[PDB]
């Protein structure tokens, strides 16, 4: 069995799933960082007293939600129920799956990329639809009803956004995007792309300011009323590692990825992700909270021409360049 | 290759592993866990019909997703088609915008009464 | 790739069955999303890279949507629908059911009468795509803008509540 | 093949009425006026018109891999934007009385012209299929105008799911078309076969399921049940609309595509469209025996006329005038149906019995009476000229059974469209320059059904004119 | 080395079986779904037509396919809507008012 | 004539009025709450809304919608049933008496001195404010004046309340239309401005400090201290408060134009305090008719 095919082969497979592994528990760590960086931004400490600094209540909160009782209602319907927070999970992990760490290690080196997460993006919006009818509630339903449409409305832009990344690049591929970063960053050129992405990406994770069951409390309306247990553990395991995907995409499609001048490749992709996981928790404790047809209005009428004109200017600027 | 077949394994191992992930904490939160029984346990949290702006949002957010599409397929191949290619995308985002315009200014897209 | 193209395709054609064959309309729009997924894993297996793509993004992300869209806004209980099981009723699907078949047949005696030197699954990128769509398919391209137009208008000027 | 500014000037009709939509859009977009979108909307048709002089001084040439410009589809974009201009003169006075929205019906009237240009110009299985589509939805939006009537939306609904039905029969179709040979465009549709291999079964098969689908948008049997309940439910300008534009650019693009395909002279393919013509024929005219209801008549007329036009469509490869009797006839049947739902459209506006017409509305009466006469292929009408060249073109390629059809068809014609142009005189228990203007439209209909059908010698040097490439 | 045939059989198999969804159903909803299935297995005819060529046409012709199948669900849904607010109810054979 | 005389503060399902002098008082005059299962259907039948009863007076797409009665706010717990087309509030009716506790009924059963403490938790967030009419009305029974140093010391503590009160407002208005840190912030200054009522009085929330003829101490030794810390303390937080969240365009997209009425409707409803004096009204009682050495202020 000794070959260096073989070998080839385990060492990509144990790559894969070292980053998968990192993924998760870095997500975990960072809704426990959520609350340690919300304590800093709010003048206080939050959670340092389960284990040294804290570090041991995401073990303690684990072992709480899989020991709590898992229920499910006897009027909702038993396999959308189980599926909503499998979606919730798994899309933006395999929308991750796609995003290169460091020359040499990447998941999936596909053709279409950031199309990829286009698609986990499009099949993540079923999990708050999912979640909202399973629970035979008419006030999740609702309150999923508004959500999703929400994320339609910012998901009409989303890939418009990242084309302009994808025009300067020539291509769909994720490496082919870092690379071109060689030089200039993409936030420069594609500053309004990194908005726009920005906005998309902060709404269809369902953060603030974009998140229904925050915004209003009053009504009970949230769709995620009924879970408990690990369900509503995973509804929101996922909501952060998608917050982590969402800033990986971000650091490799305008920040450059993981290219620097001095430091290891992974020391800045993960300086300039950490900064911007960061930059969602002072977003979530800065911004108020703007109503839902402000929201949408700001999605179509503002948001949706602007990516259409940079992508225009980009095309415009690209073969004005080429002699 | 070898790189490529190394690469399809690396995938699938990562899809697999990420799903028997969420299905064994899903069987270890269903698994682990007392049971108990109360009156009011099985009504839905209730605290103690739907608008067609829902279905035409959704409706606009699946005509401008078609256009996006159209517009990815661009995005890819700008240098090779040319100007006259950007002619002809320009010529597509003007109708896109006449009838995003023409959405906004007749109360499509305005959420409000 | 074979492999992948024909399990692909059994989960495609019974979860197809399994939506032509089913009274809740939420769990059959979940079956066309499955079968629609194994139709995009059919695509890429077949080097259509682009096709598949644009099933997941657009077929499975924004039509599929639109249908639970409906169907939620509905809130279709079953009402004359779970309570009739017209469709299982034998002497109702049974006619139907042979035409469909004699047609199946008689487009099978049709595919396999043809030369099939067999497709050799070399990727097809979206850049090929783009430049063809942009190139000998520029009408094609403007007047599909003017059909999404026209579907628009009309589906805005029918869907309204007032 | 890239474009270059002769190709731009082929395109012209199409950038013109494109242009129209954009501009008739914006104007509703600016501020919800009927008069000056409407006017904006004939306006840019009328242009087009025009411009297709321009297009005739341009020659004739291949403007894409996809498009084919000639004097066969200037002639069929003139029919067709003559039938538009006359749908919007027709729907002003029948949407004066419309409580809802009214300018949304030129923009989706405009992009239905816009899919029958592009089918008239159509030299490519995308563009047939975008074209057949370009009709389609705007007609189900135009159909369904009224969606507060229950027989306008039973209309829709039937209207939308049975082409969409047809829509995905054509579709798969060239999908085997293409699996077969390898070339979307219509000239390479069997190239690859010789030696009298020609027949082959999935070619076959990919033509027939588009047959199904083009039998749908014909009205040709047995795809016909929908015709008069679409034709009843639907508005009378829609159904003006409906009955001439969307037949005369589907029949054109058949035409073309039987013309330059090498199939298209495959012998199984033409028993089974001297079938479907045969059935269509006899089945049309019967089945209007004993309707007391003037839309599902002609919906049932409009059945048997497409039957006779299929009968001229055979004998394609084996005549010489068979497309100059089409287009005779297409011309004639324009006309005549121009002006019978033009006249049920007059007295349908605006939006809220023939008998005894004559005595409150002598002039709309005569032309009706003008109309009926034309259909059954009485002389001095211009129904009997085409119906001449139908049946001189079945006598040629020796198509007696079609030949037969045609004059037992015109047979039960005669007997109801008589029984309705006479009980059009018998005895029964507005005031704005755009219901005058429709009575004009129709008043030259039928005065021009009249002159040409005395004098049918312009119209037949102005078809044998519209030649397309060999 | 996928043969063109099975493909173009999973192909013609998918669209019968949307016929047939299409037929049997009298609910609105679930012939909309069918005509979905019906001009998804035409696409994936077309796809695989243009895949053995090695071709871009098929691809092509795949997202016209999707484009009409987008409006025409937008439409087909839109008079769902209004039957089912002016109607309440999804039988398609209930709106049959206009015959002979 | 009344539209719909229904009870307001007991539910519907009660028998006598509780106000009446020959009604029991005390809970323990009772029978002690028992829970059965019947009883607990029963009350839940009676809090079940019925569109007819309340006087909606309803087009087949007005739904209906509860709010409460449980409250994510700390301004008690009540019901709002809605009526709804679409997303407009066509109509409404509050439902209100889930935080009934009987002041007044404690009011007749307590003495004037022992009342003191329920007049504290009228307005829970007053404290002082709340304790102020009560004494002033029963020192004008006693025929009190009180002396001048009583006064200032009772309108200092109504300040300081006063500040508290709104700073719990203000920082509960931002944190609902979306902004969670002025909360932190301003319940930061509640505990300084805690800090000195605990000094002053021994308590925080109810210090039940007012007397009939002043107050129950003197001012202890250092309370001026406090105070300083206090005033240092305050207008650069308020600066701050502004700056961070009142002058963002999204919470004036939120609040600007929203729920407005102008000074007839103010005047017709009885509404007073800053939502009276918004529309343009000078109406506050510290001006207009003086009352605890208010003038010399
Ligand atoms: C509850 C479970 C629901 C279903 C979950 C998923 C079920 C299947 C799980 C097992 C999958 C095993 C691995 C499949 C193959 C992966 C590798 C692959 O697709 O390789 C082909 C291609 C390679 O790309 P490249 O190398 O760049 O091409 C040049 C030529 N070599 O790469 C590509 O073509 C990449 C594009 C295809 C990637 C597909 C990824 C999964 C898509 C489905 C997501 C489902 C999300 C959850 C459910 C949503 C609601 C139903
Ligand atoms: C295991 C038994 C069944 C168990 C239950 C069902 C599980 C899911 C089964 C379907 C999905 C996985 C299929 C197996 C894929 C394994 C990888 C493979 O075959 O790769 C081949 C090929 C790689 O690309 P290529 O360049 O063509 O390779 C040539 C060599 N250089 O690959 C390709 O070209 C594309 C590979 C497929 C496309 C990506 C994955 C699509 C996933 C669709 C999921 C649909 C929903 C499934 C729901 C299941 C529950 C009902
Ligand atoms: C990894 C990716 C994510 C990384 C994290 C960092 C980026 C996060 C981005 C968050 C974006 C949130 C966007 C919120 C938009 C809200 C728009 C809206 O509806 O505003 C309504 C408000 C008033 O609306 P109006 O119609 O005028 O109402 C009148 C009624 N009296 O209108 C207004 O107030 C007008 C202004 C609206 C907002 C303009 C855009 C502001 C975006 C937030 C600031 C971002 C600054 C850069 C931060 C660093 C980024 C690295
Ligand atoms: C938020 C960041 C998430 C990262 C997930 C993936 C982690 C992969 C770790 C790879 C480590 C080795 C990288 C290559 C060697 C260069 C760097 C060496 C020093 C760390
Ligand atoms: C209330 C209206 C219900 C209409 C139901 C229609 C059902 C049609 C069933 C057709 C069955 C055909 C069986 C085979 C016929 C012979 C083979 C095809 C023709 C040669
Ligand atoms: C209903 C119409 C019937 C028409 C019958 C026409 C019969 C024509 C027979 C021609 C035979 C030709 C033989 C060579």
Known sequence: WISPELIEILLTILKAVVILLVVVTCG?????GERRLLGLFQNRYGPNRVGWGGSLQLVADMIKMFFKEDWIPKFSDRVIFTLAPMIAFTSLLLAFAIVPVSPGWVVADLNIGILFFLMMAGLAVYAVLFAGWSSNNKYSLLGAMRASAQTLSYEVFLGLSLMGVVAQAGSFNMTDIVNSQAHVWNVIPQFFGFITFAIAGVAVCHRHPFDQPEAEQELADGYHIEYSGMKFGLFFVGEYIGIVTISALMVTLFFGGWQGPLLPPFIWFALKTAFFMMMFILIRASLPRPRYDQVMSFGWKICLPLTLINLLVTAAVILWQAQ | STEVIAHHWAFAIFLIVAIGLCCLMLVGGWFLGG???????????????????????????VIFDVEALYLFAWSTSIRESGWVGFVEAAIFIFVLLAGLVYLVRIGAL???? | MEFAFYICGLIAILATLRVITHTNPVHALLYLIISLLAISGVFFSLGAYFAGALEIIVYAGAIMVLFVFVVMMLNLGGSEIEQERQWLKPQVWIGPAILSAIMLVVIVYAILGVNDQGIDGTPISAKAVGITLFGPYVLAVELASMLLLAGLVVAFHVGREE | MTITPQNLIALLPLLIVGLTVVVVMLSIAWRRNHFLNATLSVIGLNAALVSLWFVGQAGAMDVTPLMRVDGFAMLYTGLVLLASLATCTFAYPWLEGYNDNKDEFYLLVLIAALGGILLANANHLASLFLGIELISLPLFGLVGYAFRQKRSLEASIKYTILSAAASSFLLFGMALVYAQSGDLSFVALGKNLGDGMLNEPLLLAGFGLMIVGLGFKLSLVPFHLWTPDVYQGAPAPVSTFLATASKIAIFGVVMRLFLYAPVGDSEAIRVV???????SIIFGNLMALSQTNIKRLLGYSSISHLGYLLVALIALQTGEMSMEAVGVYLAGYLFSSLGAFGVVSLMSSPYRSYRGLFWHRPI??????????????????????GKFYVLAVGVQAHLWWLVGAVVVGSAIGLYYYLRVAVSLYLHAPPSNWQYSAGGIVVLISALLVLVLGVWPQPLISIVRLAMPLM | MIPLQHGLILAAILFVLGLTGLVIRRNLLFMLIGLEIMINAS??????????????????????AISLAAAEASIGLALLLQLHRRRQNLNIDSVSEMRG | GHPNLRRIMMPQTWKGHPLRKDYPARATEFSPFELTKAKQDLEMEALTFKPEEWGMKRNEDFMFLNLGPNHPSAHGAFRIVLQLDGEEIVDCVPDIGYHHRGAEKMGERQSWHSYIPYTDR?????????????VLAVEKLAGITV????????????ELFRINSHLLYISTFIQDVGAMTPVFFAFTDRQKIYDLVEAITGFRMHPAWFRIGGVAHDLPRGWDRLLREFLDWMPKRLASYEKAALQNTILKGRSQGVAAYGAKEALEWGTTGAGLRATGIDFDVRKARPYSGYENF
Do not use: H
């Open chain 2, 35 to 61: 049971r108990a029984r109360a009156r009011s346990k099985n009504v839905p949290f209730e605290s103690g019909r739907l608008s067609a702006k829902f279905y035409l949002v959704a409706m606009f957010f």
């Open chain 1, 28 to 32: 975990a760590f960072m809704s426990f």
């Open chain 6, 147 to 158: 002396p001048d140093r009583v006064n200032v010391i009772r309108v200092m503590l109504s």
């Open chain 5, 43 to 64: 696409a994936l005819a077309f796809v695989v037509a243009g895949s053995y060529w090695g071709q871009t046409d098929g691809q092509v012709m795949y997202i016209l």
């Open chain 4, 364 to 385: 709309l009466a005569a032309v009706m009476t003008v109309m009926m006469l034309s259909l059954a292929g009485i002389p001095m009408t211009l129904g009997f000229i």
């Open chain 6, 122 to 134: 009228i307005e829970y967030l007053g404290g002082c404010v709340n304790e102020m009419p009560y």
């Open chain 4, 273 to 279: 469209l001297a079938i479907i013509a045969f059935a």
């Open chain 2, 110 to 113: 305005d959420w409000t009464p």
